[PDB]
Amino acid sequence: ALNDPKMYVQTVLDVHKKYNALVMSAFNNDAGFVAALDKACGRFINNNAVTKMAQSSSKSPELLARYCDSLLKKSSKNPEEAELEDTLNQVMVVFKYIEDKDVFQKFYAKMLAKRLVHQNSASDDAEASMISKLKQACGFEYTSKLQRMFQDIGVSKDLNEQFKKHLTNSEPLDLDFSIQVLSSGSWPFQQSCTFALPSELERSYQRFTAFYASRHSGRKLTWLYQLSKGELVTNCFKNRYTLQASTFQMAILLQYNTEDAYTVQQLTDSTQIKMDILAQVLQILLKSKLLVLEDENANVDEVELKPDTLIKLYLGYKNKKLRVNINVPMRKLLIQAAIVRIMKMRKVLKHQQLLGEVLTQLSSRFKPRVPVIKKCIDILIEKEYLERVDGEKDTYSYLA
């Protein structure tokens, strides 16, 4: 199951459905048959045995998120939107049975980010349907991050087509420029690695910022060059090569515009890339045999990548593959006590009214953050502590 959990998930789906049909025929709601159902699914499925000695326990309940990712990810011939919906419908029913739904929204949000920003998402219309279904489960606050991620994808799509119209009124760009503006505070991505923009891509850069100054006022742009790709062609080789590479590989290849060979130190100094990231980029470039060094007999494994080796562009590049693509991926217990203490005096309190009375009354030490207090109050009301009102507004009450 650990090696190939793909078919492990499919086993659970088939077993559950057939159990209901057999009972209603002759058993007539037998006491013994119904009782044995709740004991088998809980212990055997929710937490399996091999999660203990394999030092991997958090990943076990998280294999459901990747299953739904595979259905909405760009792949080969996929099932049509006629039989897939009904299988997803019963998935919602079993989802409420799990208690740690918070981690579900985290992993699905991170996986959705990589699917959308890289244009690897399939059936984008169906993606809105999937997120809409998750909204009904808990609320818009539960899917607050997810909805914003999908919204800015549509905004950027209309922004690019509006940018094309703006290009006709000015000098046409020598390259096709498309950009996902994304958003700050709603995405897992963040700028971490500094980068020197190549002189070829600067002008378009500036152009776009102008388009983002007239359209939007008081808005910055934190470009993520590690998440940007592009297509680069060669006009001096024997054959035309339209390679697809990230911004880092693009800059490394474009550095050979003026010369033929460079050392690692000059590459590091000119592009200001960190040692580890640049080492990984150089290694994956060497895997594609795009750049070679003087000594073929030298082994890259037992010889450290010292920042002095002179790598030269291989002018007789005749690699047998015409489809080169180097763009492949490389305990506190204080807040619960405070909550019960503040609910002692006031029998009935709103959720947000209770927040602040505990969130920031003791904020001078151990700033608690909203989600921690939400989770603690959830595990409290679960264990016969708050027993919130049956639906009248959002009062949480006490022993009522």
For other proteins, the binding residues in 259-278 under the rule CB under 8 A are 266, 269-270
* CA dist., res. 359 & res. 361, Å (int): 6
Single out the residue of 48, 51, 60, 228 in contact with other proteins (rule: CB under 8 A). 228
Single out the residue of 13, 15, 91, 196 in contact with other proteins (rule: CB under 8 A). 196
Structure tokens at 378: 């959830």
Single out the residue of 25, 55, 206, 297 in contact with other proteins (rule: CB under 8 A). 206
* CA dist., res. 125 & res. 76, Å (int): 18
Under rule CB under 8 A, which residues in 31-60 are in contact with other proteins?
none
* CA dist., res. 257 & res. 246, Å (int): 17
Choices 31-39, 281-289, 291-299, 349-357; region in contact with other proteins by CB under 8 A: 349-357
What are the Cα distances from residue 69, in Å, to 2, 11, 47, 76, 104? 18, 18, 22, 14, 12
Single out the residue of 18, 240, 320, 331 in contact with other proteins (rule: CB under 8 A). 240
What are the Cα distances from residue 317, in Å, to 184, 291, 293, 348? 42, 9, 13, 76
Phi/psi of residue 313, each to 5°?
-65, 135
Is residue 371 a contact partner of residue 359, using CB atoms and an 8 Å limit?
no
Phi/psi of residue 142, each to 5°?
-65, -40
367 binds other proteins (CB under 8 A): yes
Single out the residue of 95, 177, 211, 317 in contact with other proteins (rule: CB under 8 A). 177
230 binds other proteins (CB under 8 A): yes
# of chain residues touching other proteins (CB under 8 A): 104
183 binds other proteins (CB under 8 A): yes
105 binds other proteins (CB under 8 A): no
Torsion of CA 34, 40, 42, 46, to 10 degrees: -150
96 binds other proteins (CB under 8 A): no
178 binds other proteins (CB under 8 A): yes
Measured from the CB atom, the residue of 264 and 359 that comes closer to other proteins is 359
Instruction: Kindly state the helix (H) or strand (E) to which residue 33 belongs, with its residue range.
Output: helix 31-46
Under rule CB under 8 A, which residues in 60-89 are in contact with other proteins?
74, 77, 81
Measured from the CB atom, the residue of 58 and 352 that comes closer to other proteins is 352
Choices 24-32, 90-98, 250-258, 276-284; region in contact with other proteins by CB under 8 A: 250-258
Query: What is the smallest separation between the CB atom of 375 and other proteins, expressed in angstroms?
Result: 15
205 binds other proteins (CB under 8 A): yes
Measured from the CB atom, the residue of 55 and 214 that comes closer to other proteins is 214
Measured from the CB atom, the residue of 110 and 135 that comes closer to other proteins is 135
Query: What is the smallest separation between the CB atom of 39 and other proteins, expressed in angstroms?
Result: 30
What are the Cα distances from residue 65, in Å, to 61, 69, 95, 101? 9, 6, 11, 11
Single out the residue of 63, 84, 109, 232 in contact with other proteins (rule: CB under 8 A). 232
* CA dist., res. 121 & res. 123, Å (int): 7
Structure tokens at 103: 């981690």
Query: What is the smallest separation between the CB atom of 303 and other proteins, expressed in angstroms?
Result: 27
Measured from the CB atom, the residue of 69 and 152 that comes closer to other proteins is 152
309 binds other proteins (CB under 8 A): no
Single out the residue of 1, 54, 197, 298 in contact with other proteins (rule: CB under 8 A). 197
Single out the residue of 57, 199, 319, 325 in contact with other proteins (rule: CB under 8 A). 199
218 binds other proteins (CB under 8 A): yes
Query: What is the smallest separation between the CB atom of 3 and other proteins, expressed in angstroms?
Result: 30
What are the Cα distances from residue 185, in Å, to 1, 76, 149? 37, 34, 10
Structure tokens at 325: 């693509």
Is residue 398 a contact partner of residue 345, using CB atoms and an 8 Å limit?
no
User: In terms of Cα–Cα distance, which of 309, 305, 249 is closest to 275?
Assistant: 305
Helices (H), 262-364: 264-271, 275-287, 334-345, 351-357
122 binds other proteins (CB under 8 A): yes
List the end-to-end C-alpha distance of the chain, in Å, as a whole number: 46
